[PDB]
Amino acid sequence: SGPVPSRARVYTDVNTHRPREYWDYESHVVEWGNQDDYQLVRKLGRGKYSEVFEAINITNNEKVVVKILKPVKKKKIKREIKILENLRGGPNIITLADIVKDPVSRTPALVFEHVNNTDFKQLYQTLTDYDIRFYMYEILKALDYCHSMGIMHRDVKPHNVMIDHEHRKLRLIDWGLAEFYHPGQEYNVRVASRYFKGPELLVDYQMYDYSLDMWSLGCMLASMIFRKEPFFHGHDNYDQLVRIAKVLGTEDLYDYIDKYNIELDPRFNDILGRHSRKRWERFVHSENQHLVSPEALDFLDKLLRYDHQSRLTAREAMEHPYFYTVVKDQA
Numbered sequence: 001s002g003p004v005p006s007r008a009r010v011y012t013d014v015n016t017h018r019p020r021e022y023w024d025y026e027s028h029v030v031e032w033g034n035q036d037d038y039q040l041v042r043k044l045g046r047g048k049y050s051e052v053f054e055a056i057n058i059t060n061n062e063k064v065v066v067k068i069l070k071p072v073k074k075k076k077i078k079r080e081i082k083i084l085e086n087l088r089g090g091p092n093i094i095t096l097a098d099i100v101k102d103p104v105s106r107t108p109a110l111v112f113e114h115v116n117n118t119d120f121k122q123l124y125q126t127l128t129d130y131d132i133r134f135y136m137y138e139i140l141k142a143l144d145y146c147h148s149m150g151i152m153h154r155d156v157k158p159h160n161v162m163i164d165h166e167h168r169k170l171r172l173i174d175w176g177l178a179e180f181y182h183p184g185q186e187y188n189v190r191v192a193s194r195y196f197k198g199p200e201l202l203v204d205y206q207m208y209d210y211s212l213d214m215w216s217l218g219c220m221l222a223s224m225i226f227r228k229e230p231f232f233h234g235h236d237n238y239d240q241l242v243r244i245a246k247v248l249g250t251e252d253l254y255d256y257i258d259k260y261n262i263e264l265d266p267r268f269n270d271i272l273g274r275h276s277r278k279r280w281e282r283f284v285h286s287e288n289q290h291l292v293s294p295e296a297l298d299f300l301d302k303l304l305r306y307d308h309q310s311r312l313t314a315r316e317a318m319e320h321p322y323f324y325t326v327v328k329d330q331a
């Protein structure tokens with residue numbers, strides 16, 4: 001039998017209609033810029049595959065961020081660089097400015113345009129319904145753009161969204177897990193961070209697509225409006241699907257595995273159990289009411305859905321009533 005195949009409801013054949021070099025990144029030659037142009041100022045972060053530094057380009061004296069990579073397969077470095085190049089100049093997409101090798105350490109280093117990230121202290125406590133609507137709109141601009149350019153990000157989460165609230169700016173970053181959509185293709189499922197993995201990942205359904213991104217956007221929206229970070233708080237990959245099941249109910253889950261004839265690790269059968277889909281109102285309190293609205297919950301419900309094929313698209317999301325004010329305040 002085997003799993004039932006799936007296509008993407010949108011942007012399906014986008015990459016097919018492009019020159020192979022667009023998506024066949026293994027093909028891609030990298031021209032190394034001059035590592036002496038940049039001097040590193042201070043470390044900004046550390047993140048498993050990369051370290052990040054603020055640095056200055058002594059050619060012209062512009063501030064800049066350098067991401068020094070830890071060893072990864074060249075094919076994956078190529079992949080990140082091609083996607084960044086393909087996406088450069090796109091809405092709220094980080095801008096890759098240069099690529100440099102240390103002459104000795106041989107570690108590759110991506111250089112980006114400087115963007116400031118306002119502290120999560122000043123942010124979280126002062127956001128308000130409006131600001132969240134705004135920035136969710138900004139994220140959807142990026143997701144619709146990358147999806148329309150045949151790319152799925154595969155690691156949407158707070159840590160990969162930078163907000164410069166002084167200048168009401170937002171950038172979607174860390175494209176090192178993004179990959180190109182191709183109809184037919186079975187992809188690796190152990191991608192994204194645990195709280196944001198869609199159910200397709202958790203059940204080992206590999207023929208997924210851009211729709212994966214929309215699940216994690218939902219996971220973000222959820223923890224913002226209910227102020228519950230992370231929203232689905234699983235202790236391991238299995239229990240993660242249990243946390244979801246405990247909100248979205250087990251009935252819709254099994255319908256999903258049936259529709260796509262997915263083989264569930266017998267392990268899950270003894271852990272999922274029987275659960276009702278919960279109404280959103282039991283996550284609402286006094287402390288968070290001000291972010292929760294009928295439109296917020298309609299929007300959220302239409303992202304957080306086991307069946308990838310039935311989640312909103314990025315465009316659909318942008319057209320939802322939840323954003324009616326941000327689309328008018330921007331015209």
Ligand SMILES: COC(=O)CN(CCCCCNCc1ccc(-c2ccccc2)c(Cl)c1)S(=O)(=O)c1ccc2ncsc2c1
Pocket residue numbers: 044045046047050052065067094112115117120123124127131132135136157158159160161162163173174220221224
């Ligand atoms: C390894 O990474 C780190 O150590 C942290 N980095 C930056 C990440 C900062 C975390 C951003 N979280 C803020 C955030 C994001 C989204 C929301 C939001 C969610 C739902 C609705 C509306 C908003 C919120 Cl509240 C906060 S970082 O290293 O310094 C850094 C800085 C600049 C830069 N430029 C290109 S890559 C890069 C990396």
